[PDB]
């Protein structure tokens, strides 16, 4: 079925007006929760509790913050400046009659949480409501991230290419 | 008694008007909860708390979402378009004076939950109320699924039948 | 003292009008809870919080449902048709000046819960209120169940008595 | 200090009018909880939250019920008939200027709970309020129980004294 | 006392409905383990840890698999088709008031293990639980195996009776 | 830093009028909780939620009760007679410009809890509010307890000094 | 990304008027929680739940208290005298176009918690609200602490430099 | 019975789409382990622990890796590229109504282990789970390996056929 | 250094009140284990894992039980009656400024183990905790045992001194 | 196949930025362990336990430490300074379309172990995790070590070339 | 490489304030174990399991205790009084640009173990944690022990120099 790595979530800010949506690395986990409100109280009749109602749609996003990357800075301007961000969640498996497959919306920063612990690494919990996320097919592959997600491995670096802790440095 | 695999749940959408009910693969677990409201307050009399009342009937359904299958797309049109779905829960053990045995109702999408984690695979929690599920015998076997639930095993494929990750491919 | 297997619970339906109470196999566990309401608020006086009040008596019953047996079908007509059932809880140890020893009442189906999981077997949680359970001695032994509860073991079946998964089959 | 076996609790019923208090075997554990209500709201003054108030005194008692013993039947008439019971909690260690040491009160049966499980043995949770338990020295040793609590061991029974599951039978 | 060769174990399948139980050659060793669950926790009382409880009865069977013989094919349909098998363990020494002496039950295939090594020969470890094995006297001698277990030795074959690796061939 | 054994808590009763504060042995653990109430509701202004307010100061004390010792009897007269007790919490590490270092207050017995279990030993949970605990330096060392806390070990007792379970008896 | 040791938190008191902010050793963990309040109730319209609102910003700080150090004494005057403290949280990794990187605010002592246990060492939980923490770059390195955080190790001390439990003593 | 050399294991990759399954030389040993999950907890009833359940089927494979051969390169693409491999285990003894006899499945690379020691030769431990291995008859003899397994011996090479360490070289 | 025979262990019971400590013959071996609990979790600071803590001190004693000797009967009253015993472990080599050298404590009988085997002789494993064993110099030589430990050899007995299996009998 | 001496492991440090990877002499043995995480729980479906997952890749390295050589000093700066090291494992047998054949990665020092014993020589156990080792062909022969591994033997030294314990000294 | 006798371990106590570190004779063996904690959970990303973490550094020391020598008495005051000891481990082979080569730290007595057996001689197992051992060059040779470790042999003593069991006595 769909794998845990398969569904990934990208956001595009409204004010940027750019042709691309930053997504942030080191994801922890993603809960999108969607409540469809229903009829109150049957009155012991013919079923007055199976009726239509409004939908309350909210999601939370947890990840580990990196020192300085752009979806996080998008989140930072999102919460700290106070803007809504465009919300995209797509699947990495290629769509057979589209680029990718997505669910889309406009979202807000309901709350943000920052944990610093003595073990592990900094963890951000960001919670958001949305006014109705809709499903569609994803057009922008953005093959740097969704298409290409590598383990950092590269074939050799044996003459010494000025390397460091990162998974491939070059000489100067 | 009845096994955990024995009771399986199929839904048929109202708008489809088809002669068959899609059920979805990769089930996690099924809670159907049925509350029969009773008399308030004995008044220290002869028993004024054992009296009849209305019934609140609600169930939740958890499963792992597959990339694109029809009960899930039935769920997707169920929640996202906003429709009630016909609710069938039957037992795989053959009925001796019926095809199968069932409990049936008309149900609504009270809430849906979608979890994406770094481990495991995508998990959907869908919660629904119903206006009174009733018990009957199941007429439609649908022997593709209830009758036939295989492990994917097949006897050999040894001359090379263009195989893949799926449990039986054929040449082209 | 009294063992976990020692206290067993039988129900007799009101409408049946039969000389025997069906009890259901594969019990999980039984909670009977009895609240005796007391005086409110001493007023820092001589003890105005040790005073008499009404009693709220409710119990829940958990068990694993078998495909088709009669106490369960008694439960099924109990909840699904909407009837109160006569409530008997007796002890398997023989009473020395009675057949058995019991607590008795008339009970209602406040709620029923049905769990289907991928592991294990179907589990029913049924919750009920009662209007005052009373203690007495149990007259009906019903020696098929209370008196006789066997492990299914039988001495031999060695010439082949057309056996199956059940603990004793006979030839045809 | 005081051991877990050291503090034991006996009750004497009001209506019995006997010169002895039944305590029940197979104790699980005993919580006596005593709340001394205090002044509301300092008003940021000189301390208007350290002031005297009434006391709410309640305790719960858990034990494993034996088939038929008298403190349990005292509990049974306590709850089921609806009476208050005199409450004694004493220490097994001998008092140096009294028989024993006790805390005493008059208590009521606020609630009773009966659990039957498939494992283990029947367990009773009984909850009670009291109108002020007071501390004193215990006069009645009742040396059958507090003074004498044996493991059931006896030196030999080797010529055969018609024995059973109990820790000492005699011939007929 | 009873020898290592003395106690041998035969199984009869439920579905066969035959008048005889296949046992398999080349036994390695047989562990039958039977746990009688007891009372929890004395509470430092009169002995609340010597009390009765349920019994967990499980056994494992190790043997060396032969290319094609019927108890193994009984095991193979046992595990691979998924059936319970009737369980017989009898003693080779003749019973003085019965044919043989046995312990009997109905058993299931909890697990099977197959080892192929470069040394030695294929070894099967099969583990099973049972719902209560009972002791009785064995009625069916089956004198081909229990009564008769020969070393393969035969007096002569000197004119040439078309012999092979097996312990007695005949001419064609 | 400060160790778990380092901070110890002594109480002095108001009515005693003695030159010394009893502290009780066999401490379990000490929670002192101090809430400083703040401004409600910024009104999205310049910060109307960072404003000063009153302080709610409460602590709970858990320990294992000894048969008869004086801080416990101080607690007993504290709760059961109904008095406030003077509250001292000091550190065992010697102060360099004082005897010891302390936090001090006047405290009340908001609630007391007594647990008797079948395992372990009697445990008292006592909860108290205070009208503002203040920090100071501790003047009274009380070197019997804070200064001197021994394991009970003594060099020898080899000619027999009429010993018992306690860590040093003498002859008569 | 950012490590658990990487983000550290310093406070500067308002009244001190000094050119440096004390931070306290032996940190346990730091939760900063920031709630951005949003529009109530869509009314099933065009999205009236994605709207702007106020922000509730609160954090809690846990650490192990040392006998006498200045951020703790800053905390002590913070809570016990009743002052707001200036709030700085910076990252240890050097900023490439600033000294360091920080988030800054003015904060208050909403609550303080002090735990003394028999195991481990004294633990302080301090909770605070803030009226809007803002992100900036950190100017003051304070290289004693952020820049320099050593394990206490030093190369040798072999002629005897009057040493103690601390990680480097000198002769007198 | 079946010998240690008798049962040999071949794998065929899914993506290859070839009419033949590579098996790897220098086998160490093969464990195939198959767990058939059973009913939990009898409840001291009629046997609620002899019931059907799912099957967990896993095997491990140990061998000594050769410099470059195709089943190992099949294993290498299996683990390192991340593919499932078709799993065949057949017996070398000729089947009397089939080519050979087999057990078959689709298998995955759960783990791989590579040991390099100073003694002996490189040893690979590869562990795999399977979703249900089934038994059948083996159709492909592959007489190069199963049918023909020689010691490397050849009758003579006495005029000098440009020989080396391998068991038969030819001139150039 | 210190030999295996050099360190020997004597116990003195508390209740005896005698001027001498029985030690038991036929020692097997003695483990005294002493755990000094330390600081949890550095927090990657300056070393918060090198800190002081409590000490858990426990030892086990193995020996071969003799039919009736007094340290064993001291052990027997120790465990079976339930008393703590005074614990002495001294060295046989003479102290140069004391009689002997010792480590001393008060000890309890945490567990006792008795093995009877078909080979060898009865073996007792007794395990004990202690509340802090301290080191000192041993005052009581007890020269019968520590000072004098002979092989049982005596110069002659040649006129016949009514001898037996023991290493020196006398006439009657 | 591949010999125990055939596969050897070289590391190159990231910070060095040199055109060569130090490997360390006196290898003991090398375990590289690679776990490919799989799907949880079939749910008794079509095989939901044969699914893809992440890979946990870790290895341990044991060797005997030499007084001062550069891979060990690379290890020493690796662990003691705290750096990741580039990980190369190649085979000594010449590749036919490459220099050598390798598996490569970036690795970290998860743990180091140093044993000093009275027998034998110092032994270092170093354990490391890796984020995905990949297989390739080895480009750098480094013919000093991999290509050339001599026993220390040299043809003669008979006029006296100022020799010592080492396998070839020269005059001064 | 480095021999088993080559690396020896000396300790210097903090409180002594002396210009020399006692090491203890009759070493058994020395394990120093150093764990460098790493990143949790890659999240199937670019390698989030190769990240930096804290280091847990602990060692154990086994030796045979001598009747009275100073490192042992240093150990004895170490554990029994409760002090940390300065930790030095150096190599006996002369450093070419230092006196010797060392690894150094401050260490604590986590646990001590004392075994007395009937065979052999007293054996002490002492276990310790450390807050980060660092490597350096050893300055103090202490040529009595490291430089000079003799077998006890001396050329002659033939006129009788009042000798004993020790390897050289003199006349009186």
Short mmCIF file of N, CA and C in Angstrom, two decimals, chain D residues 8-128:
data_model
loop_
_atom_site.label_atom_id
_atom_site.label_comp_id
_atom_site.label_asym_id
_atom_site.label_seq_id
_atom_site.Cartn_x
_atom_site.Cartn_y
_atom_site.Cartn_z
N UNK D 8 -3.51 -3.83 60.61
CA UNK D 8 -4.67 -4.56 60.11
C UNK D 8 -5.95 -3.93 60.62
N UNK D 9 -7.03 -4.18 59.88
CA UNK D 9 -8.28 -3.42 60.00
C UNK D 9 -9.40 -4.39 60.36
N UNK D 10 -10.07 -4.11 61.47
CA UNK D 10 -11.24 -4.90 61.86
C UNK D 10 -12.47 -4.00 61.91
N UNK D 11 -13.63 -4.57 61.60
CA UNK D 11 -14.89 -3.85 61.68
C UNK D 11 -15.83 -4.55 62.66
N UNK D 12 -16.60 -3.76 63.39
CA UNK D 12 -17.67 -4.31 64.20
C UNK D 12 -18.98 -3.65 63.80
N UNK D 13 -19.97 -4.49 63.49
CA UNK D 13 -21.29 -4.01 63.10
C UNK D 13 -22.03 -3.43 64.30
N UNK D 14 -22.86 -2.42 64.03
CA UNK D 14 -23.63 -1.77 65.09
C UNK D 14 -24.72 -2.68 65.64
N UNK D 15 -25.47 -3.36 64.76
CA UNK D 15 -26.64 -4.11 65.18
C UNK D 15 -26.29 -5.41 65.89
N UNK D 16 -25.10 -5.96 65.66
CA UNK D 16 -24.76 -7.26 66.24
C UNK D 16 -24.89 -7.23 67.76
N UNK D 17 -24.34 -6.19 68.40
CA UNK D 17 -24.23 -6.05 69.86
C UNK D 17 -23.46 -7.21 70.49
N UNK D 18 -22.33 -7.55 69.88
CA UNK D 18 -21.47 -8.63 70.35
C UNK D 18 -20.18 -8.04 70.89
N UNK D 19 -19.46 -8.83 71.69
CA UNK D 19 -18.22 -8.38 72.29
C UNK D 19 -16.99 -8.68 71.45
N UNK D 20 -17.13 -8.59 70.13
CA UNK D 20 -16.01 -8.91 69.24
C UNK D 20 -16.28 -8.45 67.82
N UNK D 21 -15.23 -7.98 67.13
CA UNK D 21 -15.25 -7.38 65.80
C UNK D 21 -14.69 -8.31 64.73
N UNK D 22 -15.50 -8.76 63.75
CA UNK D 22 -14.95 -9.63 62.70
C UNK D 22 -14.05 -8.88 61.73
N UNK D 23 -12.89 -9.44 61.44
CA UNK D 23 -12.06 -8.95 60.36
C UNK D 23 -11.95 -10.03 59.29
N UNK D 24 -11.69 -9.61 58.07
CA UNK D 24 -11.86 -10.58 57.02
C UNK D 24 -10.51 -11.04 56.49
N UNK D 25 -10.35 -12.32 56.15
CA UNK D 25 -9.06 -12.78 55.63
C UNK D 25 -8.84 -12.37 54.19
N UNK D 26 -7.63 -12.69 53.71
CA UNK D 26 -7.16 -12.42 52.34
C UNK D 26 -7.33 -10.94 51.98
N UNK D 27 -6.63 -10.09 52.73
CA UNK D 27 -6.58 -8.67 52.41
C UNK D 27 -5.67 -8.41 51.22
N UNK D 28 -6.07 -7.43 50.42
CA UNK D 28 -5.34 -7.01 49.24
C UNK D 28 -4.61 -5.73 49.67
N UNK D 29 -5.35 -4.68 50.02
CA UNK D 29 -4.74 -3.43 50.42
C UNK D 29 -5.79 -2.41 50.86
N UNK D 30 -5.32 -1.44 51.62
CA UNK D 30 -6.17 -0.57 52.40
C UNK D 30 -5.71 0.86 52.19
N UNK D 31 -6.60 1.66 51.63
CA UNK D 31 -6.36 3.08 51.56
C UNK D 31 -7.34 3.84 52.42
N UNK D 32 -6.82 4.60 53.37
CA UNK D 32 -7.62 5.50 54.19
C UNK D 32 -7.12 6.90 53.84
N UNK D 33 -8.04 7.74 53.39
CA UNK D 33 -7.70 9.06 52.88
C UNK D 33 -8.52 10.09 53.65
N UNK D 34 -7.85 11.16 54.07
CA UNK D 34 -8.37 12.11 55.05
C UNK D 34 -8.04 13.52 54.57
N UNK D 35 -9.05 14.25 54.13
CA UNK D 35 -8.83 15.59 53.62
C UNK D 35 -9.28 16.68 54.58
N UNK D 36 -8.36 17.54 54.97
CA UNK D 36 -8.64 18.63 55.91
C UNK D 36 -8.79 19.91 55.10
N UNK D 37 -10.02 20.38 54.95
CA UNK D 37 -10.32 21.52 54.10
C UNK D 37 -9.79 22.80 54.74
N UNK D 38 -9.31 23.72 53.90
CA UNK D 38 -8.53 24.87 54.33
C UNK D 38 -9.18 26.13 53.79
N UNK D 39 -8.63 27.28 54.18
CA UNK D 39 -9.13 28.58 53.78
C UNK D 39 -8.95 28.78 52.28
N UNK D 40 -9.97 29.38 51.66
CA UNK D 40 -9.89 29.81 50.27
C UNK D 40 -9.32 31.21 50.16
N UNK D 41 -8.30 31.36 49.31
CA UNK D 41 -7.96 32.62 48.67
C UNK D 41 -7.32 33.53 49.72
N UNK D 42 -6.01 33.76 49.57
CA UNK D 42 -5.29 34.68 50.45
C UNK D 42 -5.74 36.12 50.30
N UNK D 43 -6.13 36.52 49.08
CA UNK D 43 -6.45 37.90 48.69
C UNK D 43 -5.19 38.77 48.62
N UNK D 44 -4.03 38.12 48.44
CA UNK D 44 -2.69 38.69 48.67
C UNK D 44 -2.64 39.54 49.94
N UNK D 45 -2.91 38.89 51.07
CA UNK D 45 -2.97 39.56 52.37
C UNK D 45 -1.85 39.06 53.28
N UNK D 46 -2.21 38.63 54.49
CA UNK D 46 -1.24 38.08 55.43
C UNK D 46 -1.34 36.56 55.55
N UNK D 47 -2.04 35.90 54.64
CA UNK D 47 -2.19 34.46 54.68
C UNK D 47 -3.61 34.07 55.07
N UNK D 48 -4.51 34.11 54.09
CA UNK D 48 -5.91 33.78 54.33
C UNK D 48 -6.18 32.45 53.63
N UNK D 49 -5.13 31.67 53.42
CA UNK D 49 -5.25 30.35 52.80
C UNK D 49 -4.65 29.29 53.71
N UNK D 50 -4.22 29.70 54.91
CA UNK D 50 -3.70 28.77 55.90
C UNK D 50 -4.70 28.53 57.03
N UNK D 51 -5.99 28.77 56.78
CA UNK D 51 -7.00 28.79 57.81
C UNK D 51 -7.72 27.47 57.98
N UNK D 52 -8.37 27.29 59.14
CA UNK D 52 -9.01 26.00 59.43
C UNK D 52 -10.28 25.76 58.64
N UNK D 53 -10.61 24.48 58.47
CA UNK D 53 -11.79 24.08 57.73
C UNK D 53 -12.22 22.70 58.17
N UNK D 54 -13.26 22.20 57.51
CA UNK D 54 -13.78 20.88 57.83
C UNK D 54 -12.87 19.80 57.25
N UNK D 55 -13.15 18.55 57.61
CA UNK D 55 -12.36 17.41 57.19
C UNK D 55 -13.27 16.40 56.48
N UNK D 56 -12.85 15.99 55.29
CA UNK D 56 -13.53 14.95 54.53
C UNK D 56 -12.71 13.68 54.64
N UNK D 57 -13.28 12.66 55.27
CA UNK D 57 -12.55 11.45 55.60
C UNK D 57 -13.24 10.27 54.93
N UNK D 58 -12.51 9.62 54.04
CA UNK D 58 -13.00 8.50 53.26
C UNK D 58 -11.89 7.47 53.08
N UNK D 59 -12.29 6.21 53.04
CA UNK D 59 -11.36 5.13 52.79
C UNK D 59 -11.94 4.08 51.87
N UNK D 60 -11.07 3.34 51.20
CA UNK D 60 -11.48 2.22 50.36
C UNK D 60 -10.78 0.98 50.88
N UNK D 61 -11.41 -0.18 50.69
CA UNK D 61 -10.88 -1.44 51.18
C UNK D 61 -10.97 -2.46 50.06
N UNK D 62 -9.84 -3.06 49.70
CA UNK D 62 -9.85 -4.13 48.71
C UNK D 62 -9.46 -5.44 49.37
N UNK D 63 -10.13 -6.52 48.97
CA UNK D 63 -9.79 -7.85 49.46
C UNK D 63 -10.33 -8.89 48.48
N UNK D 64 -9.92 -10.15 48.67
CA UNK D 64 -10.41 -11.28 47.89
C UNK D 64 -11.47 -12.00 48.71
N UNK D 65 -12.69 -12.07 48.18
CA UNK D 65 -13.80 -12.66 48.90
C UNK D 65 -13.72 -14.16 49.08
N UNK D 66 -13.91 -14.63 50.31
CA UNK D 66 -13.98 -16.05 50.58
C UNK D 66 -15.44 -16.51 50.53
N UNK D 67 -15.64 -17.80 50.21
CA UNK D 67 -16.97 -18.33 49.98
C UNK D 67 -17.99 -17.90 51.03
N UNK D 68 -17.69 -18.07 52.31
CA UNK D 68 -18.57 -17.62 53.38
C UNK D 68 -17.79 -17.46 54.67
N UNK D 69 -17.43 -16.19 54.95
CA UNK D 69 -16.87 -15.74 56.23
C UNK D 69 -17.51 -14.42 56.67
N UNK D 70 -17.47 -14.20 57.99
CA UNK D 70 -18.38 -13.33 58.73
C UNK D 70 -18.19 -11.82 58.58
N UNK D 71 -16.94 -11.33 58.49
CA UNK D 71 -16.72 -9.95 58.10
C UNK D 71 -17.24 -9.64 56.70
N UNK D 72 -17.03 -10.57 55.77
CA UNK D 72 -17.66 -10.44 54.46
C UNK D 72 -19.18 -10.46 54.56
N UNK D 73 -19.76 -11.41 55.30
CA UNK D 73 -21.19 -11.35 55.56
C UNK D 73 -21.56 -10.11 56.37
N UNK D 74 -20.65 -9.60 57.19
CA UNK D 74 -20.87 -8.29 57.79
C UNK D 74 -20.89 -7.20 56.73
N UNK D 75 -19.93 -7.25 55.80
CA UNK D 75 -19.94 -6.35 54.65
C UNK D 75 -21.22 -6.53 53.84
N UNK D 76 -21.63 -7.79 53.62
CA UNK D 76 -22.81 -8.05 52.82
C UNK D 76 -24.08 -7.47 53.44
N UNK D 77 -24.32 -7.72 54.74
CA UNK D 77 -25.39 -7.00 55.43
C UNK D 77 -25.10 -5.51 55.50
N UNK D 78 -23.83 -5.13 55.60
CA UNK D 78 -23.51 -3.71 55.57
C UNK D 78 -24.07 -3.04 54.32
N UNK D 79 -23.66 -3.50 53.13
CA UNK D 79 -24.07 -2.83 51.90
C UNK D 79 -25.49 -3.19 51.50
N UNK D 80 -25.80 -4.49 51.51
CA UNK D 80 -27.03 -4.99 50.89
C UNK D 80 -28.26 -4.72 51.75
N UNK D 81 -28.11 -4.78 53.07
CA UNK D 81 -29.20 -4.37 53.95
C UNK D 81 -29.20 -2.86 54.15
N UNK D 82 -28.02 -2.25 54.16
CA UNK D 82 -27.89 -0.82 54.31
C UNK D 82 -27.75 -0.40 55.76
N UNK D 83 -26.57 -0.60 56.32
CA UNK D 83 -26.23 -0.26 57.70
C UNK D 83 -24.84 0.38 57.68
N UNK D 84 -24.54 1.18 58.69
CA UNK D 84 -23.20 1.66 58.96
C UNK D 84 -22.48 0.64 59.83
N UNK D 85 -21.16 0.53 59.66
CA UNK D 85 -20.38 -0.41 60.46
C UNK D 85 -19.31 0.34 61.24
N UNK D 86 -19.07 -0.11 62.46
CA UNK D 86 -18.02 0.46 63.30
C UNK D 86 -16.67 0.03 62.76
N UNK D 87 -15.74 0.99 62.70
CA UNK D 87 -14.49 0.88 61.96
C UNK D 87 -13.31 0.94 62.93
N UNK D 88 -12.50 -0.12 62.90
CA UNK D 88 -11.33 -0.27 63.76
C UNK D 88 -10.14 -0.62 62.88
N UNK D 89 -9.03 0.10 63.04
CA UNK D 89 -7.77 -0.25 62.38
C UNK D 89 -6.67 -0.24 63.43
N UNK D 90 -6.08 -1.40 63.68
CA UNK D 90 -5.13 -1.53 64.77
C UNK D 90 -3.82 -2.08 64.23
N UNK D 91 -2.80 -2.01 65.07
CA UNK D 91 -1.48 -2.51 64.72
C UNK D 91 -1.17 -3.78 65.48
N UNK D 92 -0.57 -4.73 64.77
CA UNK D 92 -0.24 -6.05 65.30
C UNK D 92 0.87 -6.01 66.34
N UNK D 93 1.79 -5.05 66.23
CA UNK D 93 2.84 -4.90 67.23
C UNK D 93 2.24 -4.50 68.57
N UNK D 94 2.65 -5.20 69.62
CA UNK D 94 2.07 -5.01 70.95
C UNK D 94 2.35 -3.59 71.44
N UNK D 95 1.32 -2.93 71.95
CA UNK D 95 1.48 -1.65 72.61
C UNK D 95 2.11 -1.85 73.99
N UNK D 96 3.03 -0.95 74.34
CA UNK D 96 3.75 -1.05 75.60
C UNK D 96 2.99 -0.50 76.80
N UNK D 97 2.02 0.39 76.59
CA UNK D 97 1.12 0.76 77.68
C UNK D 97 -0.34 0.58 77.26
N UNK D 98 -0.59 -0.29 76.29
CA UNK D 98 -1.94 -0.74 75.99
C UNK D 98 -1.85 -2.13 75.37
N UNK D 99 -3.00 -2.77 75.19
CA UNK D 99 -3.06 -4.02 74.45
C UNK D 99 -2.48 -3.85 73.06
N UNK D 100 -3.10 -2.99 72.26
CA UNK D 100 -2.68 -2.69 70.91
C UNK D 100 -2.94 -1.21 70.67
N UNK D 101 -2.64 -0.74 69.47
CA UNK D 101 -2.90 0.65 69.12
C UNK D 101 -3.78 0.71 67.88
N UNK D 102 -4.72 1.65 67.90
CA UNK D 102 -5.84 1.61 66.98
C UNK D 102 -6.15 3.01 66.47
N UNK D 103 -6.85 3.06 65.35
CA UNK D 103 -7.65 4.21 64.95
C UNK D 103 -9.06 3.70 64.71
N UNK D 104 -10.05 4.47 65.14
CA UNK D 104 -11.42 4.01 65.31
C UNK D 104 -12.40 4.99 64.69
N UNK D 105 -13.51 4.47 64.18
CA UNK D 105 -14.58 5.35 63.75
C UNK D 105 -15.86 4.60 63.50
N UNK D 106 -16.87 5.35 63.07
CA UNK D 106 -18.10 4.77 62.53
C UNK D 106 -18.11 5.05 61.03
N UNK D 107 -18.35 4.01 60.24
CA UNK D 107 -18.18 4.08 58.80
C UNK D 107 -19.40 3.53 58.07
N UNK D 108 -19.50 3.90 56.80
CA UNK D 108 -20.65 3.58 55.97
C UNK D 108 -20.14 2.93 54.69
N UNK D 109 -21.04 2.26 53.97
CA UNK D 109 -20.66 1.60 52.72
C UNK D 109 -21.01 2.51 51.55
N UNK D 110 -20.09 3.41 51.19
CA UNK D 110 -20.32 4.28 50.05
C UNK D 110 -20.43 3.55 48.72
N UNK D 111 -19.58 2.57 48.46
CA UNK D 111 -19.71 1.77 47.25
C UNK D 111 -19.02 0.43 47.47
N UNK D 112 -19.42 -0.55 46.67
CA UNK D 112 -18.83 -1.89 46.67
C UNK D 112 -18.64 -2.23 45.20
N UNK D 113 -17.58 -2.99 44.93
CA UNK D 113 -17.20 -3.39 43.59
C UNK D 113 -16.84 -4.86 43.64
N UNK D 114 -17.36 -5.64 42.70
CA UNK D 114 -17.03 -7.06 42.62
C UNK D 114 -16.52 -7.42 41.24
N UNK D 115 -15.28 -7.90 41.21
CA UNK D 115 -14.64 -8.34 39.99
C UNK D 115 -14.50 -9.85 40.00
N UNK D 116 -14.94 -10.47 38.91
CA UNK D 116 -14.68 -11.86 38.58
C UNK D 116 -13.85 -11.86 37.31
N UNK D 117 -12.66 -12.44 37.39
CA UNK D 117 -11.80 -12.60 36.23
C UNK D 117 -11.53 -14.06 35.93
N UNK D 118 -11.08 -14.33 34.71
CA UNK D 118 -10.70 -15.67 34.30
C UNK D 118 -9.41 -16.12 34.97
N UNK D 119 -8.50 -15.18 35.23
CA UNK D 119 -7.35 -15.47 36.08
C UNK D 119 -7.56 -15.07 37.52
N UNK D 120 -6.86 -15.71 38.45
CA UNK D 120 -6.80 -15.20 39.80
C UNK D 120 -8.06 -15.58 40.53
N UNK D 121 -8.46 -14.77 41.52
CA UNK D 121 -9.64 -15.08 42.32
C UNK D 121 -10.47 -13.82 42.56
N UNK D 122 -11.72 -14.03 42.96
CA UNK D 122 -12.70 -12.95 43.05
C UNK D 122 -12.14 -11.82 43.90
N UNK D 123 -12.32 -10.59 43.44
CA UNK D 123 -11.76 -9.44 44.13
C UNK D 123 -12.84 -8.41 44.41
N UNK D 124 -12.94 -7.99 45.66
CA UNK D 124 -13.94 -7.03 46.08
C UNK D 124 -13.25 -5.72 46.41
N UNK D 125 -13.72 -4.64 45.79
CA UNK D 125 -13.35 -3.29 46.15
C UNK D 125 -14.53 -2.63 46.84
N UNK D 126 -14.37 -2.30 48.11
CA UNK D 126 -15.42 -1.62 48.86
C UNK D 126 -14.90 -0.25 49.29
N UNK D 127 -15.68 0.78 48.99
CA UNK D 127 -15.33 2.16 49.29
C UNK D 127 -16.32 2.73 50.30
N UNK D 128 -15.80 3.52 51.23
CA UNK D 128 -16.56 4.02 52.36
C UNK D 128 -16.11 5.43 52.70
#
